[PDB]
Amino acid sequence: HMTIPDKIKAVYEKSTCLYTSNEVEAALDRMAIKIHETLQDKNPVIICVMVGGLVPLGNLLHRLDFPLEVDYVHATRYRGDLTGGDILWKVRPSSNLAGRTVLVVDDILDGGITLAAIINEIKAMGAAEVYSAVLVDKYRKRVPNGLQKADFVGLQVEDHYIFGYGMDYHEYLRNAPGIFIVHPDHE
Amino acid sequence: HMTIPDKIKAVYEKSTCLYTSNEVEAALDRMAIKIHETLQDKNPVIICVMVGGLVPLGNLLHRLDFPLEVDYVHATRYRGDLTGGDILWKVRPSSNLAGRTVLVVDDILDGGITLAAIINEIKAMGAAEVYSAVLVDKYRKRVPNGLQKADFVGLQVEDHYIFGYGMDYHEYLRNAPGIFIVHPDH
Ligand SMILES: Nc1nc2c(ncn2[C@@H]2O[C@H](COP(=O)(O)O)[C@@H](O)[C@H]2O)c(=O)[nH]1
Ligand SMILES: Nc1nc2c(ncn2[C@@H]2O[C@H](COP(=O)(O)O)[C@@H](O)[C@H]2O)c(=O)[nH]1
Numbered sequence: 001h002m003t004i005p006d007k008i009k010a011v012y013e014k015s016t017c018l019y020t021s022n023e024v025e026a027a028l029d030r031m032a033i034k035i036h037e038t039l040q041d042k043n044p045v046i047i048c049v050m051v052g053g054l055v056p057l058g059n060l061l062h063r064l065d066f067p068l069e070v071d072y073v074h075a076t077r078y079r080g081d082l083t084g085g086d087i088l089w090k091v092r093p094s095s096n097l098a099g100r101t102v103l104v105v106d107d108i109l110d111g112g113i114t115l116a117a118i119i120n121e122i123k124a125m126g127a128a129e130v131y132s133a134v135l136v137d138k139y140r141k142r143v144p145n146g147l148q149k150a151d152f153v154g155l156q157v158e159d160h161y162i163f164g165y166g167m168d169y170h171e172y173l174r175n176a177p178g179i180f181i182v183h184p185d186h187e
Numbered sequence: 188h189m190t191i192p193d194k195i196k197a198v199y200e201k202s203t204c205l206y207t208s209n210e211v212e213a214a215l216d217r218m219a220i221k222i223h224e225t226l227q228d229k230n231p232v233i234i235c236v237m238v239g240g241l242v243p244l245g246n247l248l249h250r251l252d253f254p255l256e257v258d259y260v261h262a263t264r265y266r267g268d269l270t271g272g273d274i275l276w277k278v279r280p281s282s283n284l285a286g287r288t289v290l291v292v293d294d295i296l297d298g299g300i301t302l303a304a305i306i307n308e309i310k311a312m313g314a315a316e317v318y319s320a321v322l323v324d325k326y327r328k329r330v331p332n333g334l335q336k337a338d339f340v341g342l343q344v345e346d347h348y349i350f351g352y353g354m355d356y357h358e359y360l361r362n363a364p365g366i367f368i369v370h371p372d373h
Contacts, residue, residue, distance in 0.1 A: 005230045005254040021249060043192045048241065051257055058245010062208060062352065062364045067192040069358045070238055072259075091278065165249060171256045177249045 008172045014183035015163070019155065021177040024135075024165050025059070027154035031133060032063035034152050035103070040066035042101035042129065049118060050074035050091065052107030055166035055174060056135040056154070060105065071096075073104075073122075077114045082145055084117040093118075098126030107166050109134045109153075112146020119147060135165070136179065155179070161187045195359045201370035202350070206342060208364040211322075211352050214341035215243070218320060219250035221339050222290070225318065227253040229288035236305060237261040237278065239294030242353030242361060243322040243341070247292065258284075260291075262308075264301045270332055271304030280305075285313030294353045296321045296340075299333020306334060322352065323366065342366070348373075 019027075046064075048057045050072050061070070074090035081087060102122050106115055119130050133152040138159055142148055157179075163169040164176030173180075206214070233251075235244045237259050248257070261277030268274065289309055293302060296319075306317050320339035328346055329335060344366075350356040351363030360367075 003230075008254040043190075050259060054235065054241065054257065054259075055245040055248045058242045058248075058353075061242050061245075061362045064362045065364075067195045067359055068362055070241065070355075070361050072237065072241070166245075168257075172254055174257050175248045175251045175253075175255055177252075 004172075008169070011169055011182065011186045012173065012176065012180070014186060015176075015180040016183070017178055018157070018160070018162065018181050019179040021165070024154070024178060027135070028056070028060050028063060031152050031154050032060065035064060035133065036066060038151070039068075039101065039103060039131065043067055044101040044103050044131075045069045045071055045097060046103045046105060047093070047122070048072040049104060049106040049115070051174075052166050052168070053105045056107055057105045060133075073118060075114060075118055075121075077117070082113065082143060084113055084120065084145055087114065087117050089121075093122045093125045093127075095125055097122055099128050101129040101131070102127045103131045103133055105133045107135050108162075109137045109147065109150050110141050111143045112148060113143065115150075116145060116147040136162070136167075191359075195356070198356055198369065198373055199360060199363065199367070201373060202363075202367040203370070204365055205344065205347065205349065205368050206366040208352075211341070211365055212246075214322065215247050215250060218322075218339045218341050219247065222251060222320065223253060225338070226255075226288065226290065229316070230254055230256075231288040231290050231318075232256045232258055232284060233290045233292060234280075234309070235259040236291060236293040236302070238361075239353055239355075240292045243294055244292045246352075247320075260305060260309075262301060262305050264304070268300065269330070271300055271307070274301065274304045276308075280309045280312045280314075282312055284309060286315050288316045289314050289318070291317060291319045293319070293321050295323045295325065295349070296334065296337050297325050297328055298330040299335065300330060301333075302337075303332065303334040323349070323354075 161182035347368040
């Protein structure tokens, strides 16, 4: 009977397009300019926040024209975890970050807890400066211990269930060419 | 003293453009079409070989039009390690891969030992099928131990020391918009 790949095609067919890939590229361009002005002379280590950060960072990187390094980090947060302690670390920041300017790049700012915990841990390693870049910002959705606002924001959105351009629908659909809203039948 | 940044800026100024960003886009386009025809129904897990595969994969992903999943892996190898016997794993393949069609994505196929070791460890996790994609193939440079041919290749190149589009020069220049060759004097 019915498969997961079958449901995924269906989810995609029922979805509503919120941003075309061209609009995302535009947002990525806007961010690049802002990142340039701030970080061009900082010799930053740009940290990809796995796995949501992958396609945004990939597309963003070649728009960045100043010396930089790349690294990555991976952390997961439980549903009911509001402190930031009790977040599972898959890939930790390194001591190499000590005395370095760091830019953290993720797909979405929601509650803000994952990214705050990640930033704290990067700081705990001795990073001179820490910035944050986010493709989408769910501006109406912070919680007290969350990273309140990000330094660089591609797009501002309402609380939709969204996917595409690195954002998953249950691990699928990171490859969808834009930002899509999940039909209420599929949320 | 001379900063690492200053040296990097200089290394980029003397560099020679092998391929433009536009050329790289077109390469990625070719790969996407071939990947579609091979894997459109396999429900693959596409696996990013860190950190070289990040920008190639990131750019590639939205070109792929079929159901898929994403994961990453990280293995490094000593140049003197002529077998895969002493590759040091940063991030290992998961058990979740058991019974799955897997695509491995990397920046460059050089000798092939690092790639073949990654494929083998993936196979050992019980993977059903493993395919390999690479942005650039140094076709002349293969060793007997390494992975001989890649299933998908973006571009074939001579043995230049190269960077850009995810490929580094001592961790730098992964952001260079295209593929570039270091000046002989570097
Ligand atoms: N795919 C998807 N993921 C989301 C959405 N909202 C939040 N997330 C997930 O939650 C993470 C951020 O969580 P926070 O710690 O900000 O509450 C993101 O990196 C992302 O994985 C959404 O609408 N779609
Ligand atoms: N930046 C850069 N990396 C290279 C080059 N040649 C080989 N490498 C690195 O070595 C890996 C290939 O190793 P092999 O498969 O030959 O053991 C690639 O994934 C890449 O990270 C090059 O010209 N430039």
